Amino acid sequence: DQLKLYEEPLSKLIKTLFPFEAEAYRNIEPVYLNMLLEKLCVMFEDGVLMRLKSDLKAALCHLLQYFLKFVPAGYESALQVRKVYVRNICKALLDVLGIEVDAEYLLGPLYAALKMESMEIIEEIQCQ
Amino acid sequence: WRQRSNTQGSILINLLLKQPLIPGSSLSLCHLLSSSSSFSLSALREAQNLAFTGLNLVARNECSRDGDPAEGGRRAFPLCQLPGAVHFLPLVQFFIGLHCQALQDLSVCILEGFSVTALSILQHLVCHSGAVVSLLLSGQGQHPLLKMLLHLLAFSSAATGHLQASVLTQCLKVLVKLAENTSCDFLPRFQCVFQVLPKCLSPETPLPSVLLAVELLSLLADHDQLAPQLCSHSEGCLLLLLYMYITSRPDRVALETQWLQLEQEVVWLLAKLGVQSVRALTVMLHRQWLTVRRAGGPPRTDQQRRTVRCLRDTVLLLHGLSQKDKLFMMHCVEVLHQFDQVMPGVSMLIRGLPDVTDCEEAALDDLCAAETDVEDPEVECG
Amino acid sequence: WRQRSNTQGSILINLLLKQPLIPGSSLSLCHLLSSSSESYDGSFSLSALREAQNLAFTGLNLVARNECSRGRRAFPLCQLPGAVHFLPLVQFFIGLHCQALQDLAAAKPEDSVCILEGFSVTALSILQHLVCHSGAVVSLLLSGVGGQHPLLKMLLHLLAFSSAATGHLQASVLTQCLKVLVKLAENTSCDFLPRFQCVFQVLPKCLSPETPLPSVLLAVELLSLLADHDQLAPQLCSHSEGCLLLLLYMYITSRPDRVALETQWLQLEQEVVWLLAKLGVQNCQCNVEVVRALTVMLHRQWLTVRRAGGPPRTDQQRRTVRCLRDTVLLLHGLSQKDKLFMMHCVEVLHQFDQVMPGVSMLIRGLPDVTDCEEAALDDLCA
Numbered sequence: 001d002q003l004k005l006y007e008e009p010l011s012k013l014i015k016t017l018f019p020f021e022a023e024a025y026r027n028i029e030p031v032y033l034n035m036l037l038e039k040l041c042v043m044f045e046d047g048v049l050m051r052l053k054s055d056l057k058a059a060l061c062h063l064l065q066y067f068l069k070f071v072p073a074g075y076e077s078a079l080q081v082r083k084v085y086v087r088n089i090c091k092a093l094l095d096v097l098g099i100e101v102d103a104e105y106l107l108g109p110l111y112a113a114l115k116m117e118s119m120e121i122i123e124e125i126q127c128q
Numbered sequence: 129w130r131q132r133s134n135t136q137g138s139i140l141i142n143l144l145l146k147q148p149l150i151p152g153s154s155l156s157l158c159h160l161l162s163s164s165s166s167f168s169l170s171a172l173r174e175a176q177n178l179a180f181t182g183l184n185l186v187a188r189n190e191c192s193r194d195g196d197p198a199e200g201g202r203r204a205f206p207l208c209q210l211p212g213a214v215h216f217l218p219l220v221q222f223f224i225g226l227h228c229q230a231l232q233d234l235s236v237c238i239l240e241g242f243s244v245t246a247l248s249i250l251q252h253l254v255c256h257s258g259a260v261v262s263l264l265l266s267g268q269g270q271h272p273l274l275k276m277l278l279h280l281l282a283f284s285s286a287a288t289g290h291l292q293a294s295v296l297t298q299c300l301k302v303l304v305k306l307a308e309n310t311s312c313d314f315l316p317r318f319q320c321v322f323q324v325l326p327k328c329l330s331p332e333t334p335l336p337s338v339l340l341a342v343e344l345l346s347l348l349a350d351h352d353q354l355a356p357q358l359c360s361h362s363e364g365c366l367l368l369l370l371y372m373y374i375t376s377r378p379d380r381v382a383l384e385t386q387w388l389q390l391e392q393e394v395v396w397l398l399a400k401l402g403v404q405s406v407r408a409l410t411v412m413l414h415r416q417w418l419t420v421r422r423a424g425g426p427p428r429t430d431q432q433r434r435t436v437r438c439l440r441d442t443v444l445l446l447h448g449l450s451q452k453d454k455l456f457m458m459h460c461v462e463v464l465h466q467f468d469q470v471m472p473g474v475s476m477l478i479r480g481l482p483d484v485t486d487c488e489e490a491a492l493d494d495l496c497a498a499e500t501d502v503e504d505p506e507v508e509c510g
Numbered sequence: 511w512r513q514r515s516n517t518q519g520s521i522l523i524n525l526l527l528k529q530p531l532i533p534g535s536s537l538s539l540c541h542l543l544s545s546s547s548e549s550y551d552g553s554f555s556l557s558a559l560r561e562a563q564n565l566a567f568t569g570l571n572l573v574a575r576n577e578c579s580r581g582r583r584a585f586p587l588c589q590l591p592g593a594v595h596f597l598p599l600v601q602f603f604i605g606l607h608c609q610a611l612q613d614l615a616a617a618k619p620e621d622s623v624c625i626l627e628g629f630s631v632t633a634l635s636i637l638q639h640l641v642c643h644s645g646a647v648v649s650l651l652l653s654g655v656g657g658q659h660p661l662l663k664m665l666l667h668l669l670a671f672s673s674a675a676t677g678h679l680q681a682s683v684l685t686q687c688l689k690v691l692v693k694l695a696e697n698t699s700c701d702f703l704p705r706f707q708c709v710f711q712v713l714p715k716c717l718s719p720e721t722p723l724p725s726v727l728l729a730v731e732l733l734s735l736l737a738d739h740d741q742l743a744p745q746l747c748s749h750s751e752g753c754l755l756l757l758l759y760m761y762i763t764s765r766p767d768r769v770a771l772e773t774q775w776l777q778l779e780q781e782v783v784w785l786l787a788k789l790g791v792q793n794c795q796c797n798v799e800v801v802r803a804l805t806v807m808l809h810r811q812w813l814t815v816r817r818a819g820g821p822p823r824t825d826q827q828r829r830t831v832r833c834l835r836d837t838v839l840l841l842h843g844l845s846q847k848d849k850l851f852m853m854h855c856v857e858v859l860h861q862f863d864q865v866m867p868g869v870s871m872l873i874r875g876l877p878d879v880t881d882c883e884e885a886a887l888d889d890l891c892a
């Protein structure tokens with residue numbers, strides 16, 4: 001219930017500070033969002049998706065989306081640092097994928113991650 | 129709350145040691161020390177060592193700890209004392225002195241990129257220390273960097289170009305930061321820097337400098353002595369230029385989102401002008417009401433949500449002016465058609481918002497210009 | 511603790527930020543973060559250079575925000591993440607001039623590799639700092655292919671380069687990389703100790719007489735760190751030419767070129783006696799030579815202290831007399847371990863016999879006397 005009483009304001013703050021619209025990252029300093037990135041990383045190391053009670057988890061996954069697709073890679077931290085970040089991320093996402101009742105707030109994250117993977121693969125096979 | 133955000137509450141050395149805050153030019157700070165380039169390596173390396181020492185100090189600086197009870201004053205959000213950036217100030221002082229010397233003569237251009245990176249540096253500095261900004265303002269020519277940055281503002285007010293165009297933006301950033309970081313008592317000594325703002329209010333200045341200037345105008349109008357002094361100008365009490373910038377719309381590459389930021393800042397400044405005590409309001413309401421009325425429901429995008437709130441506080445300002453001054457109605461006759469069409473539209477649209485105010489709503493019930501007509505002749509129509 | 515963690519992160523970043531780390535080397539951490547680097551540009555392009563540089567800048571931000579907490583590793587320094595993120599830039603700058611030394615060896619250029627080597631001196635100082643308070647980068651290095659870690663491979667490569675010839679730049683960069691290496695050996699565990707066997711092959715060229723005393727001193731410190739391994743302790747002798755022992759003792763006996771003050775001398779001797787104590791607490795002419803060298807060092811120190819007994823008031827004086835104490839205990843250990851001691855020390859035995867009553871009187875003069883050393887002296891009496 002302690003979670004419940006601030007769940008929806010928390011998610012609203014996520015969506016507002018991290019809107020879907022691109023360029024939303026330019027409003028905030030990249031070191032801010034970089035420490036936010038490592039924060040979300042260590043959160044997924046905690047398996048928050050299992051450890052939390054309310055799936056409305058959906059907000060943190062939407063934040064993960066904000067990081068991945070709207071915010072470019074290499075702006076907050078380096079592309080290798082952000083890469084190992086999202087590596088730990090998607091590994092934790094797999095661990096929680098093994099056991100879940102609903103997938104809607106999780107399938108989107110995986111889609112975004114594999115999408116960026118597809119794009120970088122296309123770039124490294126730019127013409128071959 | 130034990131780390132006190134020493135790392136965030138510091139200079140943000142992570143920010144100070146980060147890829148160019150400004151767009152491009154790929155700088156970082158001692159890259160400038162690597163760059164051997166107040167005209168000599170003499171005192172250049174002195175300022176470099178002072179800045180490196182100040183950086184090490186701020187890294188080791190824990191001025192505020194566990195909650196910061198030491199920072200006191202009427203100034204809200206007193207960052208911390210942070211004597212470290214004081215030692216970093218001589219480097220930007222020297223670089224901006226070189227820049228001002230390169231500006232006063234009809235030279236080189238790289239110093240100007242170094243200059244704007246130094247301005248970004250200053251923005252970072254005054255962002256995280258109240259003692260630093262207090263000495264920046266206090267120290268006639270006190271703190272020659274302050275007078276020379278005023279001279280930079282004057283140099284950029286004419287013969288804009290592109291480098292000085294960026295200098296406008298970053299210097300307005302640091303001033304509005306210095307202004308907002310200063311208490312009410314420092315506004316009287318900030319009046320000397322405020323004297324330069326009218327040149328930035330010239331019809332030439334680009335939109336980012338314009339919106340930063342409006343922010344500075346608001347910060348100054350928070351003072352009770354700075355507001356009448358700024359309104360003591362000639363043209364329109366220094367606000368005619370601002371109002372005609374609303375109606376004029378000088379830039380087309382400037383996105384209407386940035387224009388909306390400008391508009392909200394202007395209307396909030398004028399609302400503060402009311403609490404410390406028409407053509408432009410009507411034309412911006414015309415554009416914004418067209419944009420919102422073309423949409424059939426609540427703004428799903430954030431930009432149009434801000435546009436709707438802009439409608440809200442703009443009709444607030446309109447009813448404030450009308451109740452304050454009855455000359456509002458014949459200040460409206462020249463734009464009476466725009467007004468009589470926007471007012472009912474924007475009032476119905478805000479009625480579409482479930483939340484209520486009853487003050488802005490009382491304003492709606494007060495103005496409520498309706499039907500804009502009597503009837504049109506149906507005979508020989510179209 | 512996390513407070514101590516934040517302080518140690520601040521200490522690391524400060525040791526990175528300062529005046530150029532290695533006094534006299536006008537280059538600093540920035541000297542690497544933003545480098546013009548005019549011309550291996552193939553393996554490390556200018557784009558790859560800026561890539562390593564912003565990798566490093568991000569890592570520096572992280573260690574500014576660091577909270578790295580803490581039998582395998584001797585001291586729980588930090589286990590700091592931003593260290594391996596500096597690892598890109600230092601890897602770049604250390605493969606730099608390593609490729610170039612390799613190319614100049616292939617030719618058998620210099621004007622550029624002098625600057626490259628100054629850059630790498632600064633980089634190796636950064637390496638020492640990031641093995642001062644770390645353990646993520648310290649453990650990651652210890653994880654080789656077998657095989658070796660890439661940065662470890664390149665540093666060992668340029669180490670063999672500088673150890674083969676002790677010319678202009680090689681001596682200085684060698685001193686720096688040996689500092690790095692002794693830090694590694696201090697911060698590693700017994701499992702990674704056999705990985706430094708390649709360093710055991712590179713080391714004879716380091717303990718050559720032509721190498722200056724700071725370098726060989728760091729090499730002796732490294733050897734003493736390595737001695738704590740049943741696999742490394744046997745890696746001393748049974749090799750006729752010197753086995754990194756005959757060379758050490760001919761160095762301490764006949765100091766080459768002696769271009770240093772007196773207290774600079776006997777630093778090697780202190781490290782040597784500590785190393786031999788380490789070996790003891792664990793017949794080459796590796797066994798025979800350490801006898802006459804120890805006697806001659808004890809003799810010269812007994813002269814320098816007997817010429818003016820006085821009180822141990824200067825730090826070099828107490829250092830010399832403590833060196834005398836550990837030296838005579840080591841000589842007693844040498845007499846215990848070998849019987850040919852008296853027989854094969856005859857060429858210098860007289861210098862030992864004259865010192866014997868004087869050294870015993872000095873020892874008895876010390877208000878602190880370890881009974882082991884007293885009885886050892888008594889056994890040395892005949």
Ligand SMILES: [Zn+2]
Pocket residue numbers: 746747748749752753755756793794795796797
């Ligand atoms: Zn031997």
